[PDB]
Amino acid sequence: HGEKSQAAFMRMRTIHWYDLSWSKEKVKINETVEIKGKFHVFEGWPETVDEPDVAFLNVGMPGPVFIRKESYIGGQLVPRSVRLEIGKTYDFRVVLKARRPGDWHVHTMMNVQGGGPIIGPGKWITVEGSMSEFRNPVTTLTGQTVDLENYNEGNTYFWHAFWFAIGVAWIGYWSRRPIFIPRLLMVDAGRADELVSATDRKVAMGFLAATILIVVMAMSSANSKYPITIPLQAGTMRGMKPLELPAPTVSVKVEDATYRVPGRAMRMKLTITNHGNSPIRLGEFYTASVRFLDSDVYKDTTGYPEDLLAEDGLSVSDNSPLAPGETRTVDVTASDAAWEVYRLSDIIYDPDSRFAGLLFFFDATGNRQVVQIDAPLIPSFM
Amino acid sequence: HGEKSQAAFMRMRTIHWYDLSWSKEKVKINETVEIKGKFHVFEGWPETVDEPDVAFLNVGMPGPVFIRKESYIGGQLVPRSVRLEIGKTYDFRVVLKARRPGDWHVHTMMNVQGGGPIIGPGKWITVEGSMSEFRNPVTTLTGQTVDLENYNEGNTYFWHAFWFAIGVAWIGYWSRRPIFIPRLLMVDAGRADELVSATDRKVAMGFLAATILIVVMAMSSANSKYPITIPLQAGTMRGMKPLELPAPTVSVKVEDATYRVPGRAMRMKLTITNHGNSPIRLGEFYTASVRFLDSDVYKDTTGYPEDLLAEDGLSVSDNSPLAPGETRTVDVTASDAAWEVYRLSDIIYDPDSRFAGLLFFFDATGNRQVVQIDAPLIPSFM
Amino acid sequence: WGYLWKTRDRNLAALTPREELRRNFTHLVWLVAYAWAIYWGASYFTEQDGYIITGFAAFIYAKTRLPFFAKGISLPYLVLVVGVMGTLTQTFYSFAQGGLGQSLCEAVDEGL
Amino acid sequence: WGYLWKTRDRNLAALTPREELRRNFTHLVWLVAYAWAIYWGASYFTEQDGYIITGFAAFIYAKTRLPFFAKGISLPYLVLVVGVMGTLTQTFYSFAQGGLGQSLCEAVDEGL
Amino acid sequence: AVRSHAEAVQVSRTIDWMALFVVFFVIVGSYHIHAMLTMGDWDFWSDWKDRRLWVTVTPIVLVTFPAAVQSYLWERYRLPWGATVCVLGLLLGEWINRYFNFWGWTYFPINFVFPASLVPGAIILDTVLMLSGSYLFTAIVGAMGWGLIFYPGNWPIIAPLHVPVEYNGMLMSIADIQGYNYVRTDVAPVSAFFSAFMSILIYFMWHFIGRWFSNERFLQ
Ligand SMILES: [Cu+]
Ligand SMILES: [Cu+]
Ligand SMILES: [Cu+]
Ligand SMILES: [Cu+]
Ligand SMILES: [Cu+]
Ligand SMILES: [Cu+]
Ligand SMILES: [Cu+]
Ligand SMILES: [Cu+]
Ligand SMILES: [Cu+]
Ligand SMILES: [Cu+]
């Protein structure tokens, strides 16, 4: 939720989430679900989004219905912000632990500092159980196992209720006398200096004494009960390891890409050149969380979200195998209701009518090439 | 001086100064000392220090007790700011000329524009002589040899004493009459316009005439005595030549690094893999100006500062030679008083408890690999 | 605002002090309702994201039904409704017109 | 500040002009010392990095020992001590109370 | 306006319960908007309650409405609780928001989304203004004690969340694991002294701002 109101050219041209997995789609309380995958940072990053020099790998969910146990970019734990490089592919893994029962729409997202959230595809995951059984144990370096669901809760309640009671006693010492307008009349008509007794000054210096005294004795007792404390640990971790990929043996050039206004399909003319050693076929076009597949070439077996999966949404006009060294110009239609549901047709309202995406080519064996395409997208009305 | 109050994680994770030399440790007046070495700019540069796009290679000293004759990054003279790249190793040389007698603690440092000074290791250098014998000759392009210790000094003294005398004469023309309160009484009680004579207006227009006239004739005389002048020469020099190094044939992975609170040692678990063609041994760990050495592998012969040199501070649990292709997981202790003296134990107060450093591996011949390690540093209390 | 505005008291120059105190209490109930709507509109629902009617009706009721406010537009009581301490000082001085301020100034020696 | 504050002159309404001029000169010596401490505390030792006592004691001495300053708290002479031209104008007008200003206004025809 | 004489104190006491409603619930909702708009989030999360930015910007920004309600009520009614009623209203209005919107609907735990403690600094401001009846002694001493007691007064709550944990190879505190798990979308005394020095200036400006809002003027 939240992705359909973002700009369609911003969704097409920031992050490409592919190879995504979900270890479970139905889970119990205190049980973990893992989300692995790869994300590519697009080379033509938009100027209206700030560059991902301070990015945070986040999870989209309606509040903590799962807790994030772990996050890894590469194979390295990332509890802080990271610096990602434009053009690089990274490998991520997020381990979540189920907290609230229901049916939740979980996204993988990236929070960029001057660009907000970049939301990936979301899966409905069902949590069964009751929230009372949720435990969040952690073990401190001082040798103590606490439960983070209720740790430091009675202490917080005590120290806020105490100071609220002291403030209410300070107001209520002065609100047992006539509050408004014997005193308004007493100040301007002379006697403003008999509205305050000497007993009132005794009580005020008692409050000022045993407020500072209570604060310093409470700080001393907190320092004695918790001798070992560290600061809050923050800082952007640069030095993320990009996924090192072989160069693709397929080169694709987009001649022109159009789309009907209104409609549910976009069109492309592609010049495809196989510089490999095996015949390729085009099996998938991924543009902005939506996967258009050719059924004769590729079938999805990772349980992708069905609202974002066009399992026969790719129509290639000549999808015979492409021999090595052979070049072919071909017409490719990407057609699904998710074009209109996820508001990719709302690129007509964007000040930059260009698209980006990934094409997936498959050999006769099953070896996959990932080609990154990018072109102007021209609307069609007449 | 000044380095022990900086943050320990900032000292570990900005610049690594190694291969440092000092040509002399005891010098006379008008004699030069050379400081050569290499510095590596760390890849995980902290976000609270600005990136070294405007850096200046400076010398730390208590005022000009030496004068900087020359500075070279690479082999190129750098009298201005430079642009350094993150991840690169550079070769520097600083030539100093001794000016004041005493015993001085000389550091090599880097002034980064939004991050202040990054101080390297400092050596005590003794200057013997008297400051009266110091000469600083330079030859101008107008064909004139001047001494910069006293050049333009009497001219500066003249032109400040002249204008101070003119200002004192302007105040003292008006301070020979009753200054305060015949005039305060004369202004409000009427006659404010007889406090100024016509002779006073004559003297004021004389001052206004022969102030502008003196200024323009002095500017004309300065332009006639110095016909050739240039602006001040400033500008950041990008295009520094990094030291091109071979890739290391040793790969080190830090499993976990801990340190006792309190204590004088840090610990490491390292998985070391020799991809070379000769057996290696670990001989040195450099972390933040402190060198922990293994006596059986490496001895220092460059005269490193003894407060920063742990000559037997590296304890490797298995420091037999590591055959090519062999992998070994090993426990490495870096223990010295300089951990506590130079306040590297004050990483417990830092909001980023991670360390960086360099390991040095030596073949049976003496060939040295420089591996750069970086890990989280976890305190130990119990 | 139509039912409040056109129903202004015409002979406001000669009002009973008791009926003026009744109208002062009604205007203070209006101001209490405006305070409750200021609390509900701001302190809860801006932080769920984390009284124009009631205030202009109270301004109309003070301008029409009440003396001490018919001296023209009140500046703090305009800032309060188009933007309260100056409003309450003026409201208290409005209360201190009939007897309560030459009667309450004789209860200060018997009832503080 | 204890030895200065509690030693205020009680009958300040009837003071001799000569003893008031003696106290005016003592207050001006206090202000000279405050100026010297302002110079030393600021113009030297902030630039080595490159008078609260004296000023509040002078404010106490002017408030207690001196007429023309017992009219209440002086605003420029408060800004001077908790932060001097208005201070010196007030100090000069304090000097111009006894005779010096109806006597000095007759020396303007013999001694300028 | 009243017939009897003991009725006159019966009437005004009733006004005492309706004006205390008109003060409070207007200086709750306007102090809460100011505190949310000027800070940002900045108080919603326990891993944002650090020693540098939180300790600086929280007592500087929040001395504004006490400084202007105190100058009204002490000058006008000799009522010395102008700061206490402001901090109690802000604390009540945001404790309701944490318990009924953060924990109540979003189910963030209340040990993660608790608010800061503000009552000792306001009692310092109030007792300093009442004992020394001047606003300049308040603006120096009480307004530096407002900003110097914020972190010592919040440390009995903040201190158990700063206990170090080795979490998956990294060093975190308990507040860092709280901010990491629960998914959303000598520095301390120097920061305390800078906040105490700037609170003097903010009190000095907002004293005169609340003086201008204390006016009782009429127009055309
Ligand atoms: Cu991409
Ligand atoms: Cu191929
Ligand atoms: Cu192939
Ligand atoms: Cu695929
Ligand atoms: Cu390095
Ligand atoms: Cu090797
Ligand atoms: Cu080797
Ligand atoms: Cu070495
Ligand atoms: Cu708030
Ligand atoms: Cu809030």
Swiss-Prot record, chains A, B:
Membrane-crossing residue ranges in chain numbering: 154-174, 203-223
Source superkingdom: Bacteria
Effect of H107A: Abolishes activity of soluble pmoB construct
Protein's membrane topology: Multi-pass membrane protein
Residues engaged in binding Cu cation 2: H16, H40
Gene3D superfamilies per record: Helix hairpin bin, Particulate methane monooxygenase, b subunit. Chain: A, domain 1, Particulate methane monooxygenase, b subunit. Chain: A, domain 3
Binding site for Cu cation 3: H105, H107
Outcome recorded upon mutating H105A: Abolishes activity of soluble pmoB construct
Binding positions (Cu cation 1): H1, H107
Role summary: Methane monooxygenase is responsible for the initial oxygenation of methane to methanol in methanotrophs. At least in vitro, specific quinols can replace NADH as reductants.
Assembly and binders: M.capsulatus has two forms of methane monooxygenase, a soluble (sMMO) and a membrane-bound (particulate) type (pMMO). The particulate type is a nonamer composed of three alpha:beta:gamma heterotrimeric protomers assembled into a cylindrical structure; the beta and gamma subunits comprise the bulk of the membrane-spanning regions and the soluble regions are derived primarily from alpha subunits which form two antiparallel beta-barrel-like structures each.
The protein's name: Particulate methane monooxygenase alpha subunit
Species: Methylococcus capsulatus (strain ATCC 33009 / NCIMB 11132 / Bath)
Gene from which this protein is expressed: pmoB1
Curated annotation (Swiss-Prot), chain E:
Role noted for this protein: Non-catalytic subunit of the methane monooxygenase that is responsible for the initial oxygenation of methane to methanol in methanotrophs. At least in vitro, specific quinols can replace NADH as reductants.
Topological category with respect to the lipid bilayer: Multi-pass membrane protein
This protein's GO CC annotations: membrane
Note: Products of both gene copies, pmoA1 and pmoA2, are required for full cellular activity.
InterPro entries reported for this sequence: NH3/CH4_mOase_suA_sf, NH3_CH4_mOase_A
Protein name per its UniProtKB record: Particulate methane monooxygenase beta subunit
GO molecular function: monooxygenase activity
EC number: 1.14.18.3
Keywords associated with the record: Membrane, Monooxygenase, Oxidoreductase, Transmembrane, Transmembrane helix
Gene3D superfamilies to which the protein is assigned, alphabetical: Ammonia/particulate methane monooxygenase, subunit A
EC top class, as a word: oxidoreductase
Subunit structure, interactors included: M.capsulatus has two forms of methane monooxygenase, a soluble (sMMO) and a membrane-bound (particulate) type (pMMO). The particulate type is a nonamer composed of three alpha:beta:gamma heterotrimeric protomers assembled into a cylindrical structure; the beta and gamma subunits comprise the bulk of the membrane-spanning regions and the soluble regions are derived primarily from alpha subunits which form two antiparallel beta-barrel-like structures each.
Membrane spanning stretches: 17-37, 53-73, 80-100, 105-125, 139-159, 190-210
Catalytic activity: methane + a quinol + O2 = methanol + a quinone + H2O
Keyword Transmembrane: yes
Native species: Methylococcus capsulatus (strain ATCC 33009 / NCIMB 11132 / Bath)
Subcellular localization(s) per the UniProt record: Membrane
